[PDB]
Design a protein around this ligand. Sequence first.
Ligand code: NA
Ligand code: NA
Ligand code: NA
Ligand code: NA
Lengths: 248, 248, 248, 248
Amino acid sequence: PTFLLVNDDGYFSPGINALREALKSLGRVVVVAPDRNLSGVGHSLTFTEPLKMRKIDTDFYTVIDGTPADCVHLGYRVILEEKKPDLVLSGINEGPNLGEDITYSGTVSGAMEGRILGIPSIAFSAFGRENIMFEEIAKVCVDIVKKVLNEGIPEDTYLNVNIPNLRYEEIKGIKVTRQGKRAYKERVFKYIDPYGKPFYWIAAEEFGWHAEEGTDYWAVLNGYVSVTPLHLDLTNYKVMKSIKYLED
Amino acid sequence: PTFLLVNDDGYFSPGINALREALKSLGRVVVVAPDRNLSGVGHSLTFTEPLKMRKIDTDFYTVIDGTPADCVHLGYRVILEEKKPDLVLSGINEGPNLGEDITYSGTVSGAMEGRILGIPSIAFSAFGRENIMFEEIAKVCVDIVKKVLNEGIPEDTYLNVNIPNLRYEEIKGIKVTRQGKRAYKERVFKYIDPYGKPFYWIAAEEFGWHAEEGTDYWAVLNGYVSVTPLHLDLTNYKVMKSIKYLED
Amino acid sequence: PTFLLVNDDGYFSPGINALREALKSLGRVVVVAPDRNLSGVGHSLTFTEPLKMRKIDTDFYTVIDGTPADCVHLGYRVILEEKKPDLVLSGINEGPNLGEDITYSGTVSGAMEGRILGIPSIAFSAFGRENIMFEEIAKVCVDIVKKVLNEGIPEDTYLNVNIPNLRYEEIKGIKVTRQGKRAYKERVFKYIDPYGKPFYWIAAEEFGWHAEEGTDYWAVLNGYVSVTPLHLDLTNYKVMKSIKYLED
Amino acid sequence: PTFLLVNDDGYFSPGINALREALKSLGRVVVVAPDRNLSGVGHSLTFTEPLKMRKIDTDFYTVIDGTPADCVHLGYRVILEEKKPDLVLSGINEGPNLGEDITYSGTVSGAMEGRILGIPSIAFSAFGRENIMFEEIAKVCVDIVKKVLNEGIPEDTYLNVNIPNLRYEEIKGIKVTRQGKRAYKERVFKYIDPYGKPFYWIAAEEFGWHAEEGTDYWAVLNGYVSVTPLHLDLTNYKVMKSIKYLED
Ligand code: NA
Ligand code: NA
Ligand code: NA
Ligand code: NA
C-alpha cells in the first residue's frame, strides 16, 4: 500500500515524523508537507500563485508556504502522477481538533481534500498541549490504519481522529464518536487601553466540565481515542422541502 | 427585528454596506465587522490575544484584526448584551462561496458561528469578479430575509446564499440547491526557477463546463439565486455502525 | 522627464493617485505599486518567490504582494527596460515617516532602492491621521520635484519629505531638517489576562511636547514641510579608527 | 555586567541559545526574544496592540509575536526596570546581514533600538546557509563582547558583525569593514502563467564574484569576521547646504 501523508505544522514537526516512521511497516509513506506552521492562517487551495516544491529525501517533499490542501493536490497530481494512494493521512497535529473547531482546522482540511479527490482519508490530532508523546500516539494511529486498509471507510465520509496524550498501554480503547459542541464556557473580559479606548479578551472557562458521553471531547477527556465519521457533503438534504418557500 | 451583520472583507466594503442599507426597512442592523480584508487568512475564533473594538457610528463597530467569528461573538456578548438578534447575517461577500470551497470561507463561517450560538443565520456571496452590483444584489438578500423572518429556518441548518451579478429584474428566480463539487478541471503546470529548481502552478480550467442541475454552481451560472441549507453538525450518523470495527 | 512612482499603501491609495495626477505637468509618470497595503509587514526585495505584475492602464502597473523595493526593481528593469528615469518617487504615504521610525518605513525604502540603483530619489509622507488632504499635499510635492529636476540632489543622499496636513496656501514654507529622536515619551502599561498571566501595552505619551527646532518633527508640528537628506551609506567612517582594537 | 539579548528568529533558535550560553562567562544574560521567526515580516515597535510576555526560565522571556524592537523595549523597561544593561546584543542570526540589506534586518534593528535607548549595542549574524556552527561562531562573539566591555563603542554608532561559518580556529581574523553594495548581479526572468499573464522572478547571480576589499562582504567571503560601525543618525549633515535651494 501507499500513503500520502501531509500536515499543517510543517515537514519537520515531531507529529508528522512520528507517524511517518510508524507507518513504514504497513506500506510506502510519501510525505508532502508545508515548510512552516500554517495552523494560524489560511488553509485553502492556492490557485493564483505558484508553489515551490522541494525534495528533502526520497518520498519526502515540502511545499514552500503550501497549505495542506496544496500538499494533497500536488502530492497526488505531481509526486504520485495521478495514481491514487490507498489513503491520504494528515497529522499528527500538535494539538486537538474537536467539536465545532473542526471547520477551521488545516489538519482536518488535508484529509477532506483527499476525500474530495476520491481517496479514503484520515486526520490525526493529539489531545495535549505540553510534552506530547507523538511516538506513543503513532502506535494507535497505525493500529487504525491497519484496520481501515482491511475493512474500509463508508460512503461520503472521512475520519477525524483525536488521541489522548497517554502512553500506548494506558489508552483505554477506541470509541466511535460524534462531533461535540464546544466543551467550555465563553466569557468576555473588558479592558481599557492606555489611550482610554476599550478592548476585549474572549476567554474559554471550565473546559470539559459538562462533556457529553458519545462526543469526541468526552472520549479523549476520559482516555479513549475518538474517531468521528465526518460528512464530505455539507448539504442538509432532509430539510430542503422546508425552505422551498424561498422559491415562491 | 434586529440583525447582527458581519463580513470578512471589512466594514468599509461595498457588499456589507449595500446589505446594511437595504436591511434597514426590515429592522435594526447592528454591524460588527473586521477592519481589513481577511479572506486570504485564518478565520478561527481568537482566544489567545485580546481584540480592540471601535465604534464607527451608532450600531456600527469594527473589530481590529477580528475574524468574522470574533465579530459574531463580540457582537452577541458585548454589543447586544447576550440578547439574541433575530438573525446573524454575513456578507455580501466580494466573490462566490460555492461547492467544496465553502469550508474555507470566512463569510460562511460567520453565519456558522451565529448558528452555533443558537441564532438563525445566513451567508450571502456575490457570484461575480468585476463590477459587482452590490446594491442590486442586496435587493434579493432583503427579499430572502423577509421570508425567513416569516417562515423560519429548519433544524440543524444555516443558509448559504450566492447571487448572480445581475440587475434585480434580470434574476431568473431563487432555487434551493445542494453543495456542488468543484465546477472546474484541475491542471498543474510545471516551471523551472532561475536557479534550476522546480515550481508548480495549480490551474482551474473549464469553469462551469459540466455544471450539474440541482447544484449551487448550476443555479448561479444560469442566472438564479442559490440557497443551500448546510448542516451545522458534520457527523455522519448513518455510517457510525460501519466503523465500529475500529472499537474491537 | 520620466518618473518611476511607487508606494507602500497600494496602487489605489489616494496618496499615490494624487501625486501621480499632479506630476503629469512635469513629465511622464510610470506607476508600479503594490496591490495591497504593506505598511505593517516586510519591505525587503523578494528573491526567492516570483511576482505577478499586472497592467492596470498605460504606464500604471501593480505588483501582486510586491514590496516597494520589488516595485522599484521591476519598474526599472522590466517596465523601463533598464533606462533610468529622472527620479524615483515614493508616496504620498498615508501617515508620517519621521525620526527614528524611518528605518522601518516602506515608503522610505522605495526611495532608498531608487538611490541604490543610481537614480535620484524622494520619499513623500503626509503628517496627519484623519482626513488627509492628499491633493493639497501633492501641490507642494510637485514644487519640490520641479526644483530638484533643476538643481539636483547631492552625493550619497536621498530625500525624506514630510508634509503637514494643511491646505497648500496655509503651508508656512519648506525647511531642510535633520532626523529627530522620537518626539514622545514611552510608557509601558501592565495588564493581567483572563488566565492570570501578564501582558503589556507600549504607549506613546506627550507627542511633540519637547520637539527640537531643526528636526523633521519640529518642522511639521509647526506647519512647515520637512526635507531631510538621508545617507545611503550607513557606515560611520570617522569612527573606524576607534574600533580597530577589535582587530588585535 | 548584564546583557539584554534578543533576536529575530525566536527564543528557541540555535543562534540565540549558543550566544546566551557563551556569554554567561562574562556576566548575566537576560534574554527577551520573539516566540516565532519574524525574519520575513515587519520589525517595527508595536504601539497599537498589547503584547503577551511569558517567562520561560530565570532571566529568559518571550514576547508573543513581539518584534526585536518590542523585545528590547520591554526588556529594558519591564524586565530590567529601566536600569540600563552594559550591552544590548542581537543574534546570532540564522543568515547574514550584509551591505544594502542591513536596512531590512530585524537582527540589526534590535541592536539599533538598544542604541536609541542609550545603550551600546551589537548585532551578530552568521554568514552561512546550511549546517551553521553556531557554537563555534559564539566563541568569536564573546571575544568581541569582552573587548567592547573594556574599550567601548564610539559616538553615534552601533556594531554590525557577520561571522563566517567556520570553526573558531579556522577564522582568519577580525576586520573593521564598511557596508558594501550588493555583492551580486540582478537579473529578472519572465514567465507566463497558466492563464496567459506574465510573472517575474528577480534572481541574484554571480554572488561575491566582484567583492571589494574593505567591505563586509569581502571580509566574510575571505574567512574574516566583519565588524561595521553603523550610524544611528541617518542625516547627511554635510550636504544640507546643497539642498537649501528647496527653502527658496
Ligand atoms: Na496545527
Ligand atoms: Na471575502
Ligand atoms: Na504606509
Ligand atoms: Na533572521
